[PDB]
Symmetry: D2
Subunit: 492 residues, 4 copies
């Protein structure tokens, strides 16, 4: 697939004529190219979104919702193509590709359904002939930056609320996954999104990354990705004071209390560690199991993990890592854990596969025993199918170990003790706490976290409300002479 740019209502090439290659993570070979937009291409996109703003705003949320619902319907009718792009670009197992598309459709529906419901407010003024009207309006130009890990889902997550609320958009996806973003944009265009409202830019971070976030006309940046990139964004966006929506790294603790339903804890851990090969912002990244059940728990976890099939999307339980860098990083991580005296209970290397799969970026499920709380494998995001395990014996200890983390997104808890449940609901300082169940997040939740996890959040009434700016109108309708305490009336 050769993907293109979409700027001010037309599909176009990069104005340098330059491109970037797309590699299959399943086979390791080139399967596609995308355009490498220049800064002038970016300026044109941003100017187009500026010019389209007032008419997009004036249409109203209901009319905007009709277009967004239309896009959902076209996506749904032709979902197989999108599922296939995800399998090709990411190597996801077919059921993950299908589930992610299910999420694309669910999100678009959910966000468009907010039409004419995100109300402003009327407040008492400082007299009986004064009121304060509080309107919720769009921020203006939204830059939407989506990561490679959920390359369809994350596009729906950002475009649908930005658009429903009356902002115009310039979307730049990950260069590892341009295809799924392009396809979704195309469907929005087919749905009737007007000229300049939705723009699509691909290119190298090193050429256009700072430029698109620091640009004088940007009003809001909505981004999911790496912590380091979110930090740079926040630095650069000081040039425009853009409203920021950053969802960054996670290091979810997975906590299994002595009274946990073992089977459910273990099903959920297989999901939480190995879904999308651990390439999830809510992946189980630390395992804490009560000492009374630690040995039986770990034995069964290793035995189940042994039964996972890697390989082709058509039949694998688990797919490859996104690119050669992710693979080299993951090996380096495991080798550092080894050189620290961590014990590898299973995995820890790339397997030797045959056929075209020999050159994909496959990594084995990897379980690490008696992992130090202060080690790199406990303190730094891994984003791959590797986890360390540690024993716990008390509730206060469990809370303290979990919160001793620079990340604060998801977390998991298995127990039948209602008091641990309710207490942890406040004591576990994480944006999401999953209790006796797996993720992923729901559209009605507010996907967010504490500490290095970022800024603002996505989903729920509050997430869609992050794309609205509250403004105040103070009116005086007394029809009488003003009296201002610090201004002498004898001047009049």
């Amino acid at each position: 697939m050769d993907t293109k740019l979409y700027i001010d209502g037309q599909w176009v090439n990069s104005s340098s004529g330059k491109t970037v290659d797309k590699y299959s993570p399943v086979t390791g070979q080139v399967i596609g190219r995308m355009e490498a937009a220049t800064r002038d291409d970016v300026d044109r996109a941003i100017d187009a979104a500026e010019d389209a703003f007032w008419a997009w705003n004036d249409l109203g949320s209901v009319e905007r919702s009709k277009i967004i619902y239309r896009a959902k319907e076209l996506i749904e009718k032709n979902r197989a193509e999108l599922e296939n792009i995800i399998m090709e670009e990411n190597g996801k197992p077919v059921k993950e590709a299908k589930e992610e598309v299910d999420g694309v459709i669910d999100q678009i529906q959910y966000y468009a359904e907010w039409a004419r419901k995100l109300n402003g407010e009327v407040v008492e003024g400082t007299s009986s002939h004064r009121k304060i009207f509080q309107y919720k309006v769009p921020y203006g130009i939204v830059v939407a930056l989506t990561p490679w890990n959920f390359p369809a889902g994350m596009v729906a997550r950002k475009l649908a609320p930005a658009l429903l609320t009356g902002n115009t958009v310039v979307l730049k996806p990950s260069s590892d996954t341009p295809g799924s973003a392009e396809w979704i944009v195309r469907k929005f265009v087919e749905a009737g999104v007007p000229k300049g409202v939705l723009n699509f830019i691909t290119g190298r971070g090193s050429e256009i990354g700072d430029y698109i976030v620091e640009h004088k006309k940007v009003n809001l940046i909505t981004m999911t990705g790496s912590t380091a990139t979110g930090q740079r964004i926040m630095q650069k966006a000081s040039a425009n004071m853009a409203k920021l929506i950053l969802e960054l790294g996670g290091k979810a603790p997975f906590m299994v209390w002595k009274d946990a339903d073992m089977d459910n804890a273990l099903k959920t851990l297989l999901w939480a560690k190995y879904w999308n090969a651990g390439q999830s912002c809510i992946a189980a990244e630390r395992l804490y199991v009560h000492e009374d059940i630690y040995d039986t728990f770990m034995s069964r976890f290793v035995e189940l993990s042994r039964k996972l099939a890697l390989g082709d999307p058509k039949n694998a339980d688990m797919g490859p890592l996104i690119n050669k860098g992710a693979l080299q990083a993951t090996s380096e991580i495991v080798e550092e854990a080894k050189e620290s005296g961590a014990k590898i209970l299973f995995g820890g290397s790339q397997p030797s596969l045959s056929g075209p799969y020999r050159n994909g970026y496959f990594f084995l499920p990897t379980i690490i025993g008696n992992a130090d709380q202060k080690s790199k494998i406990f303190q730094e995001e891994i984003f791959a199918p590797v986890i360390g395990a540690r024993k716990i014996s008390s509730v206060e200890e469990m809370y303290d170990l979990a919160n001793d983390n620079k990340y604060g997104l998801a977390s998991y808890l298995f127990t039948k003790d209602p008091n641990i449940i309710f207490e942890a609901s406040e004591r576990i300082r994480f944006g999401e706490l999953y209790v006796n169940m797996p993720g992923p997040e729901a559209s009605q939740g507010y996907h967010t976290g504490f500490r290095m996890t970022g800024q603002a959040g996505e989903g729920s009434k509050y997430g869609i409300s992050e794309y609205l700016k509250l403004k105040n109108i103070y009116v005086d309708y007394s029809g009488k002479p003003l009296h201002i305490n610090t201004v002498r009336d004898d001047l009049f």
Copy 2:
């Protein structure tokens, strides 16, 4: 007066006992000294607030509200001491001082009244035996950074909601106004704020500024002040992803349509330009008057501006600029305008005062006619008693000129046309729009702006909610085996 630090429940000196002087804006003589905190002092205050956190949180908003009400009561009873400190430190006219204390009292009441009212939410889960609980909890450690212009009002604005919602606080006021902040802090301490909950730090921006906003343990920064400082903060807080509440510059358009109540608009303009010597984040900074009335209006505004008295707080209409750096900078602004050919209709220099006041940092009302829309005096914030006026002739032009502005806080509109009032409520892209009345803002409004004016807002339900983080708890209580579409049940 001499001010000290307050750290972990005790008044203490700077770790090294270094101090900074304080000058009277009314006489230019040294009148006070403050402690120069060190980086170590900031650490101790932040560590103190970390330790106090859980017990403060655990106290509940009701019990915390009792302490805050007590502080209000002690403030109200001893208010004359605070009025006097504002007059000495800032040189404000007695009625401005009194008014700022009225607002201290009003704000502390308003915010404490939120006890037990900032609810979380319950949302439907993905099955009948699932729910998503959404708790609002405190961010943790709040760094409060207050400006010199409303040095009592701004301290109340930040402490009251930060404390009510269960955060601990380190407060660093402007080195131009340490006294009013210390006095309020001391009132909260007398009201029984527990050790560690509220810390007070003074010192030089150049020595401890970056340090305090970049610190590892800071969860939230709430700051009002200059745009350039807010930009630096946003850059530095990329080190901790602290939630940002930034209230930065304004360049308020003051718009008088042809059918305006002339007397009321002129009253309101005298207030909006000359209150606190124009040193207000909502000061009139551009004057747009309808061509039919421009001449009469400018004429009257000049004559009125001539009648305002500058000098002693006990009898002036208008006080002095905060410091010699403000004075230099205001003269330079006026000189740039005069040398771009701008027409000075009145004033434009320091008045001619006798006695001690000739050494104070006074500046006359300065009115410029037929200003250029793209000039410095229309595009850059002045924060001084200077304004240029331009003719307007259409409603669309009025909106466009207002909006052609890197700032986006307050704005003023005088008209008796309902369709302009309603349309402008959306077309004027400013945080606040005062229609047929002056400011200042009410506690129930969401004080905020668009564009360079900053991040988030203060006041109203929404402003106090900025000090709360929303977290989700997903619970499954089916009590049945889990089924996860991507995890094979034949493994169990």
Copy 3:
């Protein structure tokens, strides 16, 4: 057409097969028959809705929303059948019929969009280890009682939110308009509403009216219709304390101030008096015109009213009254007015039509001049194309006269004075105030009134929330012995 009952998943006859006739308001000839439910039939429908309840509740709002959307889609596709039934049953002009179906579609969409958005709340408990969860759950069995005036629109208004929020329903429409209701019911059944969830009952008010509203198992009654019936309902529902949603009479004041846009006010008045022959709960029922313009306004309103055509739905401006009882009652109203000395400026009788239409229940536009504020025609609802006008001369008088009214639904105001618009927003004690525009109400408004107009409201977040009951769960998770101040611990 012949209509049947729908009970527990099957179309069925009356237990005894008794029927009621239906007359064309356009020709006065019998055109249809409906089943006469018996008390036993009502029991079976209520029992059915009781049984279906838990599984309907358990389905979740998302899944229920899918059924409701499907019903909308089937309605939209087959809309011409519903347009034709409204024209036959009610005699509405083709553009009124089409418009009422547009509103059916709009409402079903708007309400289904609330899926997963009507959140519960979490509130702070009386200790750090306590919370109060507040769930919104359905009331249970909803009895929906719809009037004949908007016989499609009103059915959509009540079913859509009742079903979305997880209630089961028994619907009993007006015996004057069974067809439009049955057709919509059949669309929900085709959309897959599960057995028992939606039941359809027709029959005589005198036989089953009290029975259905007093029934032991009814949890909620939602009714629009005449005041006297709503009074009877409120009395009868004292037997079950059912939650009441009652939308009863209106007596809307139509107020034209001296500076009104004359053309727009006259347009709006033609709509507000003569839309649906004045058979609207928001029809203009009193006309108050400023003394400066009264003569010109009345003169123009008369000439315009003369030009409106009465007759066939295919080409009339105005249709007939619903039944012969409406016609008798309108003549009596006009005769009472003529015999109290009221001055008839136009009309006041049945028109002179040819052919089948001479047997239809037509009534001319009727305009009375210089009406008395305390007269029947100003104090009692007419629900027919009749209105009297009075001069007004002050703003306080306008408010007072508007408010001197046992009803409190809609009102209309035409003026270009902002201070009147803002002040009237509070001074006019009516549920709806239309300023410089006509109705009807929008789905996002809270359709409601003061005084005799009834109980609760419909539309907006608040209206759909009326079908949800809030319950509290208080939880203590301290895990420590309890201490209760009035219970001695020395007993333990």
Copy 4:
């Protein structure tokens, strides 16, 4: 104590000169008289509240809150007198009297704190130059009817929200408890409540009960009491369509699961059955205990109940019933249970006390074994210190037995099973579910119930919001010619 009436700003006698005697429930002797207001007295009170309304409204919620806070402070400063009136009029133990006053103070604070926070809403209109403004305003005249059981608490509950929200009030307390109501009214008057805003009427139900609720000018009735009285009120209020807030009977099930913490379950049951001698709308009125622990549970409950002291407020654990009728009713209830073959495990009669206590209305704690689910003691409210116990063996059974009740207010649940907790939160169809803790309700909860328990509710944002009416203002500010689909433009 001779209590008087307060009508239009003056303390007065009944205009018939008639009175009603007040009896001590401790001694059985006359200790007081109250005025027996006539209908004309009622008309005067209601007219006074009508006349005071606009000025009370215009004051604003903040100014109204100052008066209400002032009343709280005067109550708090002189609380001993109120505690003493409660002990005298009701016979409550001193700690109950003190706790109820604590509740009076807590409620008044909580409600007044809603000043300027119960916001209206701004909603999108049907074009870009249309909005819908939604204001929350007072209903008007509130009739407040308070019961004898919490004769101070229930007055604070009703007056504080009614008044804060800008309604005027006519209060009629129970004739068994005029003293505590009068005292609270007096304190509101001392706080500065203006003339006609707060009116105080006492008299016989049979003379003025129907009259005050059916009166033409009443806008809202807020009542707590008996189910039969609430039913009559709802019937009579059909005359004015008053907004209704009725809290009526309860029959709380008290459920103790096999894994319950016995000590806490038993402390809570002593409270729930014997607080205020069972004269509570949330009293334990049915006991369900899991068969595995039934016999040990009942043994300990009987042994603890044996240890409760009846008698004088100064030292009793439990006080007398309110009057001779309550005593005769309670005996009749026990004798009917006996004649049905219920087994009385303890109590069931009035004790033979000495001194003045011999003529008080004392009744022993009464526990009844193997009580039939369909008996009067399980199906009808008792409101006295009598309870029956029944075994359970499953969760579905427990839910079904609990919901098989015509009441639906409070309920109690002791268990350590988190799944029963979460599931019951939806399955237990009661307004309040107390889990591992006692009542009473908190000011931030929404005290309400299902089925016969009444209408609307009190407390929380939603309870105070029941005293506000939401109104809509639809504005069109296009400034263009209207086009109405069903009105021909060629008429213009």
